[PDB]
Amino acid sequence: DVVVRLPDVAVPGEAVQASARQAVIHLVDIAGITSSTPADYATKNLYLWNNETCDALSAPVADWNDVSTTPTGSDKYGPYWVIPLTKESGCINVIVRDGTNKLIDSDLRVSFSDFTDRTVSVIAGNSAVYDSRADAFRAAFGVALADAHWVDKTTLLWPGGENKPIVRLYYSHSSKVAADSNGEFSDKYVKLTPTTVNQQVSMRFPHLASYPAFKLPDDVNVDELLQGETVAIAAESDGILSSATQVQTAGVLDDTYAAAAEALSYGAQLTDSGVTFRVWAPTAQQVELVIYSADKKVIASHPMTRDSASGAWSWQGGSDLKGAFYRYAMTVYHPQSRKVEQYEVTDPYAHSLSTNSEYSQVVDLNDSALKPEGWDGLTMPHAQKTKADLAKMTIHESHIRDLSAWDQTVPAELRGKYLALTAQESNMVQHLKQLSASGVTHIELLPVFDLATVNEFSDKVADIQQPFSRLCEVNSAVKSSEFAGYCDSGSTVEEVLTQLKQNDSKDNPQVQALNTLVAQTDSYNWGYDPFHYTVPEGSYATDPEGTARIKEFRTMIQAIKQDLGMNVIMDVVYNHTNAAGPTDRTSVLDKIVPWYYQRLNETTGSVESATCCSDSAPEHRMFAKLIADSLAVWTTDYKIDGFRFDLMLYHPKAQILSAWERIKALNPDIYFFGEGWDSNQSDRFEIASQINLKGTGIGTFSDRLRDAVRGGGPFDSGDALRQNQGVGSGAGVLPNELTTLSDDQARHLADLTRLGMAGNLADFVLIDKDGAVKRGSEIDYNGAPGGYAADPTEVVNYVSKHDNQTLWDMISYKAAQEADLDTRVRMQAVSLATVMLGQGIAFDQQGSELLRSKSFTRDSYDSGDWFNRVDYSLQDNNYNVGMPRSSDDGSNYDIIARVKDAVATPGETELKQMTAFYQELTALRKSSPLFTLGDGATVMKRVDFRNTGADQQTGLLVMTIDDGMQAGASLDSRVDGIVVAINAAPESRTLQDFAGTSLQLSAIQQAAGDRSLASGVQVAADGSVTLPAWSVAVLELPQGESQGAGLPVSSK
């Protein structure tokens, strides 16, 4: 059993020792064995200086651009320097360079008291100072990276151990493994022997299936090794170390503890007998439950009891702990810092919290005191049982502050709060009530779980409605900025921003300049920054301390369903955490079970950030359980009707489906949907994407109709924003001065739009732009198959969302100069019509009915009340209120300045006009079951299109929905068929397709008179129908005594 040791055999000696009044410094340069000629260390030099601290240097270098401090000499182990000294006592500061750069990113202090010989050595890319070149040398053979994966009880996967004679797994309980003084590894260890990856491991971690496999003895005490640091080391026959790296243990943790741990319940569980606390921490050395008083003083610290089979820790107490604050005191090794950390953490299964989430709190959500009157009997206003039920879903995506921050008719104390929804007299609530009466069925809420990016301590926050003096007191960045002069003015921040507007331009973006500072300490953020997954956000409650927020959240939910008549969908963000590591305030999960809840890079062990932040690992069993347990609470205790999964594509398809199975047992009608783009995680598992979820019943946002109607894509910048016109903005038919879009390209977008109005089904058959018969999957969408769904209920169509530019801002970027204000309002309505009158589920951004603008801001997550403003007093749409954030839209300033003032800014006249158009569309959507068939096969048997092929009139979309004898049963007793005609063009168009068929304009549109989207439409005696420019008409075939012939789908 050779004793692994650092390469001490061929270690460098000492080029030279220091004499009198001189300090020698070595730069050990690992020269390859083939070193045939002394490398050129001519460009090598140091930077000397003797400030207040160290002043032993004798006439140090002055300029930083002085590279004459070249080496005094060199050998086969690097160059060395002989620094003159005035005193052989004290220290000196140096910076090893290779020219102008810093060979070492750090200042070095050569303490003579630490090195009496005053002869040190340094390593390239090292921060420590060694006493000899031999030490620095062996130092370059220490532990690096973490490409070793302990995936199961007896399997280790590690590249660096391939072919190496000696492969072992060393471990230390309380210390960091490393060669001792001598230079040999004397720590305890277990011998590994080459093996082949089994079928089980290959299936669990496909992306590691080709890694060199190593086997561990069956009698190894895994539990003990997982208590401290573990390191994989490789060495030759002589026992010399070739490489040593850290080990990722998520895999073995699941294989050892997951099944037993999955069978238990977690959090502070208050029941009859009392309370039982349980937290999963399989690697912790110790765990104590710390109880705090209301004033946050420690009342007691109880060591918990560890269950060997599960790795969970528990503690049982009396029911008198109800309402108590607590945290878990951890003693655990964290691989990132390579140290046994000691810290207090909140409960990841927390169901209540103190202000700003500093302490978790024991709570019983079933408590009547935490429920509004009549809560238990709260019913779901809209059905979600059958596919036809689901298809009627019409979503209004909203944000707590966007809704009431600016409404003066909402009581001041409730602005930006959950309770604003209960102010029935306010403009905002009355507006939502009317939208509901008109056909909007669901309210989707941006992050209302506990987010981390807003300080819940009110005295640390300042909003634009408050004095500029308050902003200066809570924000030091402002106090040291160019706006500091406003600190002692008597103006509010909003008043200052308003006066800055006149002189604001691309050359002086002063509005966003000030707002960027305001954003750091205000109450605003979308909230895609998870702190705790199963506790409501505290800043949206009137009182963030304790359980109060729970009852207030429920009061809001009740108000929406009972008083507004709409179902509620919650946006969830399980794909990432706000932070990881052993030090960040918001790192919870990664502090309790380090390296388990986060997805890590296979080689470095660093937490990935593809999501934006700290990527989570839903593929790990206990996080999948946390997610499902969390969704169960929101479903049962908060009565949420559906969930929108943020970046669902980063979750395994199997995990999302398993979670749905679990929740359906609680609420059989719950609906799941989310972003199913490409997460690039396919190498690790089958992702929950648009393609993979086909036929599962899980919905996904469709980017097909979205891009075809809006024009362009979410990554466009500069002139591309104007060049890429959409069907909704006149592609081909009303070109602007920059576009080069051909008629063919415009018709391809129309193919995508028609396919989307039919549910974006993979098997739907249509006639494309060239007159060819094509299935939905055959219509191209940037190289990918267009149609991907099995049922229209698996598709969520939309033309505006919180992400990216608003619909109005896109139309402003793309509309031709000659399209006047009135025309642009109709373009917004025409664009929304493709969604509202389509078979897919309808989704829209709060405010599209008010021509909402963000002053061109593309990503407004932290742009505050100013750029996210929605005026329910209907004075304007927030357009032209200053150039957007330069950090993300600066490259768009030129194009913005060019298109911004083309027409006037919408006023009350235009806003009222748009709301009417909007409610007309939603009212039409629900006026007949034909608009929402739900089932794919039924859509294929009843839906067809006219005005298709090479001889089509560009921009005119004509869809027919059959209810005649050839379709089967009559689903609508008032009609034998319906015709949807959208004329997205500046010309009047005449349809001869239904001559002599007795077609009639919908009663709903007739009733709107000249305020209808169909104003001016004429149904002639000869049966022909003429539509004016930018109009929408819904026509119907009145049903007689029996089922008529209807509008049979044409054979293709």
Ligand SMILES: OC[C@H]1O[C@H](O[C@H]2[C@H](O)[C@@H](O)[C@@H](O)O[C@@H]2CO)[C@H](O)[C@@H](O)[C@@H]1O
């Ligand atoms: O604060 C994190 C992150 O939030 C936003 O990004 C979200 C986006 O809004 C969601 O629709 C989805 O794409 O997930 C993203 C990450 O959670 C902001 O857009 C982004 O700037 C910010 O960093």
Ligand SMILES: OC[C@H]1O[C@H](O[C@H]2[C@H](O)[C@@H](O)[C@@H](O)O[C@@H]2CO)[C@H](O)[C@@H](O)[C@@H]1O
């Ligand atoms: O937060 C991620 C990212 O999501 C969206 O981008 C999608 C895009 O919408 C899809 O059409 C397709 O290209 O995949 C993209 C993600 O890879 C948002 O549009 C974007 O703003 C956001 O950053």
Ligand SMILES: [Ca+2]
């Ligand atoms: Ca020395």
Ligand SMILES: [Ca+2]
């Ligand atoms: Ca919070």
Ligand SMILES: [Ca+2]
């Ligand atoms: Ca903010």
Ligand SMILES: [Ca+2]
């Ligand atoms: Ca990867």
Ligand SMILES: [Ca+2]
């Ligand atoms: Ca009928």
